[PDB]
XYZ file of C-alpha atoms in Angstrom:
134
model
C 8.991 -11.111 -17.783
C 8.191 -9.505 -14.436
C 8.708 -5.779 -14.017
C 11.734 -5.015 -11.858
C 9.413 -2.995 -9.630
C 7.677 -6.183 -8.475
C 10.880 -8.056 -7.726
C 10.849 -7.813 -3.948
C 9.827 -9.898 -0.952
C 8.561 -8.905 2.485
C 6.845 -10.060 5.676
C 3.221 -9.258 6.498
C 2.238 -7.862 9.883
C 0.608 -11.196 10.702
C 3.740 -13.232 9.984
C 3.312 -14.358 6.362
C 5.776 -14.227 3.464
C 4.837 -11.871 0.625
C 6.157 -11.784 -2.926
C 5.808 -8.719 -5.108
C 5.616 -10.998 -8.129
C 2.260 -12.256 -6.827
C 0.851 -8.942 -8.078
C 1.776 -9.575 -11.723
C -1.214 -9.988 -14.026
C -3.706 -8.321 -11.722
C -4.583 -4.765 -10.696
C -2.946 -3.727 -7.440
C -2.439 -0.693 -5.257
C 0.406 -0.314 -2.788
C -0.232 2.265 -0.089
C 2.886 3.493 1.707
C 2.208 4.650 5.254
C 3.865 5.385 8.604
C 1.977 4.826 11.905
C 2.781 8.295 13.254
C 1.724 10.157 10.146
C -1.445 12.165 10.683
C -2.156 12.270 6.990
C -1.958 8.471 6.796
C -4.191 8.188 9.827
C -6.681 10.377 8.000
C -6.495 8.462 4.732
C -6.661 5.011 6.328
C -10.486 4.801 6.406
C -10.573 5.985 2.793
C -8.125 3.359 1.591
C -10.048 0.746 3.549
C -13.331 1.790 1.972
C -11.967 1.722 -1.576
C -10.289 -1.636 -0.929
C -13.593 -3.085 0.281
C -15.458 -1.695 -2.735
C -12.972 -3.135 -5.216
C -12.251 -6.796 -4.409
C -10.834 -7.242 -7.918
C -7.904 -5.051 -6.879
C -5.217 -6.316 -4.545
C -4.474 -3.621 -1.976
C -1.187 -3.829 -0.106
C -0.290 -1.525 2.747
C 3.449 -0.928 3.125
C 4.239 0.361 6.613
C 7.592 1.974 7.221
C 9.621 4.330 9.400
C 8.724 2.636 12.678
C 8.596 -0.741 14.412
C 5.951 -3.476 14.448
C 4.166 -2.444 17.678
C 3.399 1.007 16.264
C 2.225 -0.585 13.024
C -0.130 -2.912 14.907
C -1.579 0.035 16.842
C -2.308 1.806 13.558
C -4.016 -1.209 11.972
C -6.023 -1.746 15.176
C -7.204 1.868 15.266
C -8.086 2.244 11.591
C -10.160 -0.046 9.250
C -7.379 -1.476 7.134
C -7.072 -5.002 8.536
C -9.018 -6.397 5.567
C -6.063 -6.166 3.172
C -2.408 -7.196 3.282
C -0.115 -5.050 5.435
C 3.677 -5.270 5.007
C 6.025 -4.417 7.871
C 8.829 -2.718 5.916
C 11.117 -2.113 8.890
C 14.275 -2.472 6.800
C 12.788 -0.035 4.309
C 13.529 -2.263 1.324
C 10.009 -2.121 -0.114
C 9.830 1.676 0.072
C 13.276 1.839 -1.526
C 12.135 -0.456 -4.320
C 9.461 2.067 -5.309
C 11.553 5.169 -4.735
C 9.351 6.205 -1.820
C 11.130 8.303 0.790
C 8.115 10.038 2.309
C 4.539 9.060 3.080
C 1.902 9.008 2.091
C 2.412 7.524 -1.362
C 0.564 5.169 -3.687
C 1.858 2.756 -6.311
C -0.668 1.752 -8.955
C -0.007 -1.510 -10.750
C -2.033 -2.426 -13.820
C -2.463 -6.057 -14.985
C 0.346 -5.623 -17.512
C 2.792 -4.810 -14.741
C 2.934 -1.081 -15.452
C 3.731 0.867 -12.281
C 2.812 4.473 -11.533
C 3.872 6.059 -8.240
C 1.962 9.021 -6.844
C 3.488 10.893 -3.928
C 1.130 12.779 -1.678
C -2.358 12.515 -0.255
C -5.274 11.206 -2.259
C -8.997 11.788 -1.989
C -11.507 8.959 -2.038
C -12.685 10.064 -5.478
C -9.214 10.129 -6.981
C -8.280 6.748 -5.503
C -11.555 5.303 -6.794
C -10.936 6.711 -10.271
C -7.318 5.515 -10.377
C -8.321 2.053 -9.192
C -11.041 1.873 -11.847
C -8.499 2.881 -14.492
C -6.369 -0.161 -13.639
C -9.149 -2.428 -14.880
């Protein structure tokens, strides 16, 4: 059965429906960010680089604590348009992972195991954690 952590739905920044269950059976990384967060602005290029280097992993940005326009500005300014971005304006996705503050990362292995890391992450650590999922 699906892990309760993946039982959520959301809307992508570009108007598509997203189902957390679509991540079951594959490695995935959810990156929780806020447009106004300087730390997220700094980590954006890093997450984008790791996402590009690991096409086997489904990266999902989860934007919160602001409205769509601010989220679009962030995605336009930093290189993270290559992977799915969720507009979590109602904060339900963050709540589902127990995330109250950004930045944060949720690592999902193919078995559905979920590990949440709160705080910043270097390119090396993200790379190593992503590799561990496979």
